[PDB]
A paper describes a structure:
Certain bacterial species from genera such as Paracoccus, Pseudomonas, and Alcaligenes have evolved to use DMF as a sole carbon and nitrogen source for growth via degradation by a dimethylformamidase (DMFase).
The mutants Y440A and E521A were catalytically inactive. Structures of these mutant enzymes determined by cryoEM show a loss of Fe atoms. In the EM structures of the active site mutants (Y440A and E521A), the interface between the large and the small subunit becomes disordered, thus suggesting a role for the small subunit in the substrate entry pathway.
Author numbering:
A (entry chain A), B (entry chain C): 1 to 410, 416 to 465, 471 to 761
C (entry chain G), D (entry chain E): 156 to 310
E (entry chain D): 8 to 95, 101 to 131
Amino acid sequence: MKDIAIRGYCDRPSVATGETIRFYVSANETRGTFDAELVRLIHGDSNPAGPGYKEEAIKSDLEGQYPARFQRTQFGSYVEVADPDAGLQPDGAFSVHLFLWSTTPSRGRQGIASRWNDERQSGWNLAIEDGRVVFTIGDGSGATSSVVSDRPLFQQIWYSITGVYDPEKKQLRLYQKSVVNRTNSRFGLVVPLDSDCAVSADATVKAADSETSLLIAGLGEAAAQDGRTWCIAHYNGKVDAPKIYGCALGQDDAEKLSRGEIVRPISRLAHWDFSAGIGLNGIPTDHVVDASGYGHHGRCMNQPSRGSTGWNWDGHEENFIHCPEQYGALWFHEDCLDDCRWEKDFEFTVPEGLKSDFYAVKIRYEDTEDYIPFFVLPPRGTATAPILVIASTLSYLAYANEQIMHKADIGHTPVLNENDVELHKNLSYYGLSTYDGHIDGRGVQYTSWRRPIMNLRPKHSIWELPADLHLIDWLNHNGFEYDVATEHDLNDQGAELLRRYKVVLTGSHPAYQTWANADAWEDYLADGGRGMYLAANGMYWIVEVHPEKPWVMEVRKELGVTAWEAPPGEYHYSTNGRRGGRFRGRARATQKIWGTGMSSFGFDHSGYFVQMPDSQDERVAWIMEGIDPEERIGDGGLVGGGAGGYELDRYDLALGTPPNTLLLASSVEHSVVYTVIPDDKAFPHPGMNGGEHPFVRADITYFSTANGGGMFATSSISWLGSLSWNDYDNNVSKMTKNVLNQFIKDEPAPR
Amino acid sequence: MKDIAIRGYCDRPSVATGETIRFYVSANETRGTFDAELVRLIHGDSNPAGPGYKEEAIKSDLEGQYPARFQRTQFGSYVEVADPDAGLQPDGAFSVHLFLWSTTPSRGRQGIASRWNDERQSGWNLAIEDGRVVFTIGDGSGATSSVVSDRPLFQQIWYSITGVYDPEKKQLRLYQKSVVNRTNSRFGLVVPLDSDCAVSADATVKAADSETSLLIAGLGEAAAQDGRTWCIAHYNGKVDAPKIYGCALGQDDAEKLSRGEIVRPISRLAHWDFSAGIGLNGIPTDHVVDASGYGHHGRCMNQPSRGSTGWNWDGHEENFIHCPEQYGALWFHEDCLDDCRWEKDFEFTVPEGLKSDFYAVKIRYEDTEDYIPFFVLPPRGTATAPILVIASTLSYLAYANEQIMHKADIGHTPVLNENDVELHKNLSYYGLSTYDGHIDGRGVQYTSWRRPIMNLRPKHSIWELPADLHLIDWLNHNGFEYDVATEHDLNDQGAELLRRYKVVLTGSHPAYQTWANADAWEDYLADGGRGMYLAANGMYWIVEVHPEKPWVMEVRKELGVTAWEAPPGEYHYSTNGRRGGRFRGRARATQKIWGTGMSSFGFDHSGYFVQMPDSQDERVAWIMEGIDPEERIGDGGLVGGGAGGYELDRYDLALGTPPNTLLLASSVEHSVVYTVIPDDKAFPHPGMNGGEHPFVRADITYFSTANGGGMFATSSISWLGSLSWNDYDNNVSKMTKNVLNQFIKDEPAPR
Amino acid sequence: QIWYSITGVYDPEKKQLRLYQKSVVNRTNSRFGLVVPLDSDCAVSADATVKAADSETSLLIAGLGEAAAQDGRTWCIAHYNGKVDAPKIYGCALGQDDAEKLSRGEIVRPISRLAHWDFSAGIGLNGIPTDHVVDASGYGHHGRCMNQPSRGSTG
Amino acid sequence: QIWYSITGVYDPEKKQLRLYQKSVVNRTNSRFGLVVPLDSDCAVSADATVKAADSETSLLIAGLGEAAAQDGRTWCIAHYNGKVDAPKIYGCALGQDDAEKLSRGEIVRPISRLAHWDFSAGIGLNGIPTDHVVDASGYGHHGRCMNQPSRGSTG
Amino acid sequence: CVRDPSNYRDRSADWYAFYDERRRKEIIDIIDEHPEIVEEHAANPFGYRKHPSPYLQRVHNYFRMQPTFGRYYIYSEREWDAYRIATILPELGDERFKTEEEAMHAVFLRRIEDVRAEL
């Protein structure tokens, strides 16, 4: 079919003047060259009923031909303990104990702990194959020796597994024992569970040096070429405190290990504590500590979930920073990705005479155009405009590589294209999204910029970079001079970024903010700053950018407008130790800063605004200026079919709308598809729907702040998609143009 | 209409042999005598389509005549600091600083901190009248001086307020200043809030000794007869850290007090820290510590909310046991009631020869029969029957005085009687329920036994004590010899209570349990114990009985099958510093013990069960003994007209149902009004109803445990109501009787 | 200066007072260490003739009440010198196995307690700046330090 | 023994070397306190007349590489004496406002780091019993303490 | 500035007035264009083994969520055998009823008359 043959990404989302961005490109097979050139994105939405696709080409020092090639991607979570000297390949006896929690115990061959080679069958591994636990040694001749558990594992049940090799008796052994209590495992203590065993086997071969690294939750593929060990047989579920001894262990000693007790502490070789480094600021590191004192430190790879519930967890503390001794597990999925680790193809250092706007590098392969978007900032410490436009990159990372077709293998018949069929065909090159879930049933918490985000390209509810190019095209079609920042840069710079501008606009779906973004907006509006919020669902989810990996973003979700909920002890972030669920449950609701906040949502079509009795107040005779007081504000539009639809925010004084807020209009004609969000339901009952409940509405509001500041909010997604209707001649664009011409002037906003 | 003229309560829910219960009775006016006698409750429901009301009279040392009198009820939260020596009535200058978070700031005259007499205008009070903080002193001659603030208070905004009396200038002063931040108040920092004043007035009187106690959140009514001070003008909302200084402050000094600084420490007369006492076990006491070092230790009355959010709460810690210096407030409603403090009219020691069952004292006044239900236990450490019946007392306290008619002032047009209009007519005598809310809008957390509970009475879904009398009448009609415990007693005794009995039968709606109750059930069913769960919605909420006051129950709710939701930083219980929302979110879901857990609720009628293919199984042919496999199980009942309805529990392995569980039947024919509970929802899409979603069903299950144990679950509230249909000739009583005759034998339950 | 765990039992059924002393030294807490052959444990008993009447005073740690409390003040006479760690009162007689379990730092019969004063309740990250002693059992019998004993001592 | 925040910038767009020295004394960290009128702050600049070529050595905190790394071992010659707290390399050219923000402990421009060694990452309740240095910028440029400097020193 | 809570009011109540107006017109159109749902609810007001029509269910979902739903309780004394309709200390009605299905349907008719009386 129309097969995508070229991919790419940036290392960083936003680049100011005088600093360097890199581009990492991969084709399906290593042949040929590819063209590259820089464009300026103006309007991305290629609906023929609207303005059409627009781009401006820039004569840069970036273009030319570059050799296309293929770049392999590691895909799955593990912990790589690098060992060049084969110190974790003992010669005599050795024993491996770990606590295990398998979430898919029958999905193929799954390696738990290994220092293994799989081209030649050499080394040792402790793996899950055929539903059982198998402990194997090999020497490289193709000859192995395995010991297989009598009792297979259960799904999501804690087990304490010891694997013993003993050269004196020439014998492999294996001690499985299930360690459930009232709270940790899938079912509880009322089962008559007999899943303990103690088996043994004859050893014929020795464990040879595998010439790889030790891996948790995976097997080494071949010997490490150029110091990189690939990983193959990935694992799904928790591993708690693995350890290697340099001695054979009995059954009494494995029984003592099963109760959480470090036996023979001079006979250890390694003991990775997964809860070493938990402070009062979470565990913002990808570093795993050898707790024994032999220096065999590890490194988390592709971001497994730190701060997970461990084997000794009883529900008396549910914040991992206050009981780190019961939170020593990593979750280890098989479909994680924080970085594709490709090689750089070309880099670009931004010139001096380049206007701050939305840019992309258009890459032309044989029969495929590919765009790699990035945002160019103004120079550092300056402001080349009176208007700032916040690009909602944290919600670009939320929906990043969102897979609709892959949700059918775990309304209104969703329309797909050639980008989504590559997301389904190559999961391993792209990753998942926070609206998805892993194959274990847990939602994706971590998401990343350093991967090809296939639904971020400008062409083809839209993919939310075209939905911001709506606003960009409206600003360029009028005579407005604007800058561009991102939510990562607002996180970095605080309100100091915002105070350089007379008015800061908002992207079309700003749903995932950090806590410091909310502080920056609050401190900005509290002293003189103006702002527009031309969107809905605007401060719903709390998000933290990772401190060691700033391209990685963490969210953890709960009951609300969600796709998944966090499991029952794990509501706190790894990156900082704070709660961070949704903003409303922290008493920083969206109404408290921006006037309105999330009220209802649905998926079929849109409505239109009807003028409220505050429309005829003369204090807002500047907003409702060239608009007749009997018209429908926003009937017709590119997104859904109207201006008020698909998500809505409402006026609410009980959540923190300022008392002087005026209520200008509200949206009507919403179907029974739309529903009141679960945040508002005490008892659910029928009639909690659109048209049958008074919380299904958008609300256009204005309020003034101190020192000549103000805030205008329109409370719907499709407001920006309605701006170019009827060739820019409608009530939506006239209202938005009135408020933007008022906000950029050299006088206080009215009261 | 009918006017209830006689009221009463016990001091405790349950009494064993040889120990004393005390009955506290109050009439309208002090005249005449009332009769009393002891009855045994058999069947409570007086539906003429059923068995009708049944009881048995008992000769005892109780019956006679007693002088009927009126007994006055103190109503509403406050803090009573006793002061005999008039140490907190200064002769010179004094000042009063406190923080303030008013929720109903325009509901009449509300006293905040006072040492005041309201009969003769003497003492000093800091109060709110006409929306404004008013500082008033008086001398007993009826003449008062008062200073009134310029700015009225905003609702739920934090204010620092300082009232100064200054005899050197003969001047009253008042320093009001608002202390909003991002997280503590109703609206944030973007408002241009101007609610600060420094007013002054002349002192024309002095301050005389009021001869009362110092009252936070209220005013003393009259002089302290018998050492008890009555409180009249009850304040609604938080008060954080009051203090009295023995000097006259300034404006700079009030500005320093506005920031949390304790100025002039040696000049304090009293300083109550409401957060001193918070440890890792919470704050399980009603003691208030004088942090100024003078022994003026207060006492919380009528249970205000310990562990509430203070004025300095930025939302970084949401557990009060871990940051207790930001949790120094106390909510103080006006319609709290934990204890009526009435005088004992008569007492009753249980004789040696008395069977353990449900009992009550029938009081016959002029035209009104009122009952006072209590529970007689077996002797301590023994057991007199092979069947134990658990009376669900904690979910009697949940629904205690549940005021349907009072909810309008905050389906199916609810039916009432004279017990409801007495609740509506005398709110001060009865109190509220955990489904109710306060007048502050926040739902009621603490509920109490020591008060007349009007829907505990056996006559007249039903009031949940007749719903247990359904089971008691079914047991008495057959030849089963049983004992009766309560959930308070299971809380006290542990699994040692349960292990004395072969089978243990759960009540009709056991929805509220403590954590140790579930531990005791799990340790009972794990090791040989047998049980029956004849109900739905069985282990939903977590409850903690108060340690000092074993008649008071705490619950704090959240999103789910709820009426109210806790405000953001106030999720952790005062009595034990532990999370305790729903059981399902603490990884101890109802499936993990009993086999089925909550799936859907509704409020119109009930449905019938349809047998699954596991009903034809040969292992459970003993359950389905007299039942033809083409029948409907329970089509017709005294509750909703069917055996499955009004709340439904389902089978779910992902929540912890044991794997050897056999699914016997399932309920059908549920209306569109049966919604799916908000726990099971990711995105609310239309169709979350009965007849359309696959989660609206009940599930009759059975699983066997170790040592000959087992658990039979029926997943419906109306199952006990369907027992007596067709004059005890139905499928419901045959199934219950088959499983109960199997469970009472000496052989193990079948596997 | 040697740590001991002392239980005193009164039992009206057998009409008997008992007393369980046991020394609990380890490497660091006491005056001398674990190299001594210390035999200072005992378990004695005596016959009871009288009942314990109401003394009309307050409970005192490290002292005896002098006379009955006139105007709510209880004087103190036979003062004590040295540490007392976690005192507790039960409402039941205790055996020797149960006092042995108490000696290892273990709250036996937690529904049979009457009082348990935790001298390390309220230690935060700002020290313990209070003269308040908490009844840890949950019966509300809170105490009050008088004449400032050293909080934050080694137990 | 005074604490200084120091930032050295190379800037090829202007062909300019810069250096931002600023003293960060407080009450407790330095040799003398806040009462001194300490003036030891500078923002100087000069012209870049060469480029930076690959030295073919290792990166050395507290020293200079002697010659090119024969056999993978780099010899260190000009040994520094005294504390170094949290070095970092940025892949861009900073300013004076940005060096002022770095002077306060803020990690400015996190996505532009090339390496950032936290010398305190690894401290647990067992101390820091290792000579590993963690690259806190997420690039695997993990150092290695040689000849045992004093871990757990005052920052 | 914002300095007095009497100058400010919940402006959402403007939209509640507009919403209640359009919702009342919708409901009386549904009742006048479907007059068999009254007979339907008279036959079986609980829906016991015969679930309501979507239009009857829509009229229920309008009635069962208004702030005026707090009127019209059904009262029944313990030593009485009839049902009366309380009205908001309530005011008891005068018309006795044998069964409570009759009382619930009379409350349904009286609510339809009340929603007609406001238009």
